[PDB]
Design an enzyme around this catalytic site. Structure first.
Site, mmCIF file in Angstrom:
data_model
loop_
_atom_site.group_PDB
_atom_site.id
_atom_site.type_symbol
_atom_site.label_atom_id
_atom_site.label_comp_id
_atom_site.label_asym_id
_atom_site.label_seq_id
_atom_site.Cartn_x
_atom_site.Cartn_y
_atom_site.Cartn_z
ATOM 1 N N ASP A 1 0.800 -1.222 0.000
ATOM 2 C CA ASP A 1 0.000 0.000 0.000
ATOM 3 C C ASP A 1 0.835 1.276 0.000
ATOM 4 O O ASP A 1 1.007 1.915 1.034
ATOM 5 C CB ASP A 1 -0.967 0.008 1.184
ATOM 6 C CG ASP A 1 -2.262 0.728 0.873
ATOM 7 O OD1 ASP A 1 -2.349 1.359 -0.198
ATOM 8 O OD2 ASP A 1 -3.192 0.666 1.699
ATOM 9 N N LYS B 1 1.309 5.085 -0.878
ATOM 10 C CA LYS B 1 0.519 6.278 -1.142
ATOM 11 C C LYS B 1 1.218 7.516 -0.601
ATOM 12 O O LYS B 1 2.241 7.412 0.068
ATOM 13 C CB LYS B 1 -0.877 6.146 -0.531
ATOM 14 C CG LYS B 1 -0.894 5.520 0.851
ATOM 15 C CD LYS B 1 -2.312 5.218 1.301
ATOM 16 C CE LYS B 1 -2.345 4.024 2.237
ATOM 17 N NZ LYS B 1 -2.876 4.377 3.581
ATOM 18 N N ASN C 1 1.702 7.992 3.172
ATOM 19 C CA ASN C 1 2.759 7.166 3.738
ATOM 20 C C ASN C 1 4.134 7.796 3.600
ATOM 21 O O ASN C 1 5.081 7.380 4.258
ATOM 22 C CB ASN C 1 2.765 5.787 3.075
ATOM 23 C CG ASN C 1 1.756 4.842 3.684
ATOM 24 O OD1 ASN C 1 1.915 3.624 3.616
ATOM 25 N ND2 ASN C 1 0.720 5.396 4.304
#
Ligand SMILES: Nc1ncnc2c1ncn2[C@@H]1O[C@H](COP(=O)(O)OP(=O)(O)NP(=O)(O)O)[C@@H](O)[C@H]1O
Length: 283
Positions: free
Chosen positions: A140, A142, A145
Site C-alpha cells: 500500500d 501512497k 505514507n
C-alpha cells in the site's frame, strides 16, 4: 517461500521491554486506513521525554519471501523502537516524523521543478528496493505514507506490514495485477511508484472515476495521454513504469535498471543513501 512473521514483541537494541504505562498520550498525529496514529511521550528510561508516533492495531504480521525488524532499518524508512501487546492490542512505537507529508510540503511552494520531485523519487526508490531485497512488499504505497523528517528527507510511515485495525485499499495506486487480484509483487510497488511520479509531476491522478469500480476499469483499460511538458527522461521513465503487465514493467528485474535510468543521471546514489544530498525544501 513466503513466510509470515507475526509481530508480538520488539525491543530496540540496548533498551528494556516497554509497556503502555511508559508512554503519555498527547495528540492525534493523524488518521490512517488502520486507525489513528498518535503522538506519545515516553516517561521512562534513557529516552524518557522522547516523542514517538504510536500505532494501535489488533494484530500485525510481516510476510517475507524466504531480526527482520532490525534489517528493515533504513535512512528513509520509519524506525521501530518498541512493539508490545496488552489486552488484545498490539502497540507500535516508532519515529516521530516532524516534516509532515511530502505532498503538503509541495503544496506550500508556488511551483517546483522536475529536479525537486526527482530527489524524493530517488530516496523513495532506495527505500522501496531496500524492502524488496528482503522479500518484503510495501503493498500500500501512497502519499499519506511518504513523510519528511526535520531536514526534508523522505521517511515511509510503514514497511510492508500486514495489519488489522482494532476498531472492528486505495485503488488509485493499484497495479492492474492487483485489481485483477493476482497478488502484490515488487513490480506492483514500481507501478505505484509510477503513479506517484505522475501525480507529483502533473498534479493529477492518471486514473480516477466516480466510484472505486470505475477507477479500477480505468486502471485496467483507460487511455492515458502523456503530458508533453515533461522532459524526455521523465516521459521515458514514466512509460517504462506504466506497464500493465508485471515482468514487462521496469523494476521487476531489480532496482539497478531504475537507478541507471537517464532520469536519474545526475543522482549520486551513495551520497543520497548517506543523506549527503540536500533536500529541495526545509519543512
Ligand atoms: N511516524 C509517524 N510520524 C508522524 N506522523 C505519522 C507517523 N506515522 C503515521 N503518521 C500520520 O498518521 C497518518 C496514518 O499513517 P499510516 O502509517 O498510513 O497509518 P496506517 O492506517 O497504519 N497505514 P495504511 O492503513 O496503509 O494507511 C498519516 O496521514 C501520517 O501523516
Amino acid at each position: 517461500v513466503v513466510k509470515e512473521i507475526p509481530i508480538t514483541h520488539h525491543v530496540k537494541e540496548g533498551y528494556e521491554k516497554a509497556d503502555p504505562a511508559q508512554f503519555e498520550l498527547l495528540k492525534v498525529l493523524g488518521q490512517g486506513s488502520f486507525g489513528k496514529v498518535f503522538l506519545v511521550r515516553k516517561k521512562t528510561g534513557p529516552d524518557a521525554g522522547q516523542l514517538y508516533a504510536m500505532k494501535v492495531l489488533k494484530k500485525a504480521s510481516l510476510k517475507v519471501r524466504d531480526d527482520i525488524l532490525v534489517e528493515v532499518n533504513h535512512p528513509f524508512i520509519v524506525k521501530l523502537h518498541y512493539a508490545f501487546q496488552t489486552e488484545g492490542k498490539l502497540y507500535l512505537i516508532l519515529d516521530f516524523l516532524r516534516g509532515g507529508d511530502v505532498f503538503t510540503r509541495l503544496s506550500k511552494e508556488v511551483l517546483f521543478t522536475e529536479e525537486d520531485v526527482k530527489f524524493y523519487l530517488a530516496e523513495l526508490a532506495l527505500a522501496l528496493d531496500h524492502l524488496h531485497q528482503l522479500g518484503i512488499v510495501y503493498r500500500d504505497l501512497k502519499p499519506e505514507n511518504i513523510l519528511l523528517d526535520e531536514i526534508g528527507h523522505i521517511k515511509l510511515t510503514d514497511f510492508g506490514l500486514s495489519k488489522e485495525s482494532v476498531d472492528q485499499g486505495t485503488v488509485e495506486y493499484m497495479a492492474p495485477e492487483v485489481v485483477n487480484r493476482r497478488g502484490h509483487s515488487q513490480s506492483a510497488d514500481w507501478w505505484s511508484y509510477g503513479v506517484l511520479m505522475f501525480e507529483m509531476l502533473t498534479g493529477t491522478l492518471p486514473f480516477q472515476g466516480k466510484d472505486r469500480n470505475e477507477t479500477m476499469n480505468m486502471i485496467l483499460k483507460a487511455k492515458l495521454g502523456m503530458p508533453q511538458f515533461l522532459s524526455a527522461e521523465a516521459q521515458s521513465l514514466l512509460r517504462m513504469l506504466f506497464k500493465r503487465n508485471p515482468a514487462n514493467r521496469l523494476g521487476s528485474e531489480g532496482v539497478e535498471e531504475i537507478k541507471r535510468h537517464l532520469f536519474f543521471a545526475n543522482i549520486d546514489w551513495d551520497k543520497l543513501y548517506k543523506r549527503e544530498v540536500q533536500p529541495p525544501f526545509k519543512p
